[PDB]
Amino acid sequence: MSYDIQAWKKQCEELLNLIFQCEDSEPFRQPVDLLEYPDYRDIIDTPMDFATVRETLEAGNYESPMELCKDVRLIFSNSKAYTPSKRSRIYSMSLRLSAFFEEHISSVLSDYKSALRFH
Numbered sequence: 001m002s003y004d005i006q007a008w009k010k011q012c013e014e015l016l017n018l019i020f021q022c023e024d025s026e027p028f029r030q031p032v033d034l035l036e037y038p039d040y041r042d043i044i045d046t047p048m049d050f051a052t053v054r055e056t057l058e059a060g061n062y063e064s065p066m067e068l069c070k071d072v073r074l075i076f077s078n079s080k081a082y083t084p085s086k087r088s089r090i091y092s093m094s095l096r097l098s099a100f101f102e103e104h105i106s107s108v109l110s111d112y113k114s115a116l117r118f119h
């Protein structure tokens with residue numbers, strides 16, 4: 001529906017489903033195991049992963065698509081900080097998936113901002 005302030009919840013649910021099914025999401029699907037990777041929290045202030053984002057959305061704990069968008073960007077910016085080398089296949093995966101996410105989210109954001117002006 002045009003001007004729907006609730007539309008972003010279904011749009012983000014479906015975009016996350018597409019991300020999970022994409023091979024480039026593999027490293028970012030679940031929280032980093034800290035006892036497996038002991039220096040992760042030395043580098044990363046605020047861990048984030050797509051399972052946390054999906055669970056937060058399904059629980060209704062995002063107020064806006066901007067909030068969900070901030071958490072997804074944190075996944076990609078954490079990857080660039082932990083895996084900064086352009087040689088890394090993981091660097092390449094987060095680059096491709098970030099570009100994919102940013103392409104889909106832009107219209108979710110602008111539709112939401114239109115809907116909120118209307119409301």
Ligand SMILES: CC(=O)Nc1ccc(Cl)cc1C
Binds near residue numbers: 027033040078082083
């Ligand atoms: C989300 C994240 O950066 N995870 C990760 C990536 C590459 C390597 Cl080699 C190890 C880990 C734990």
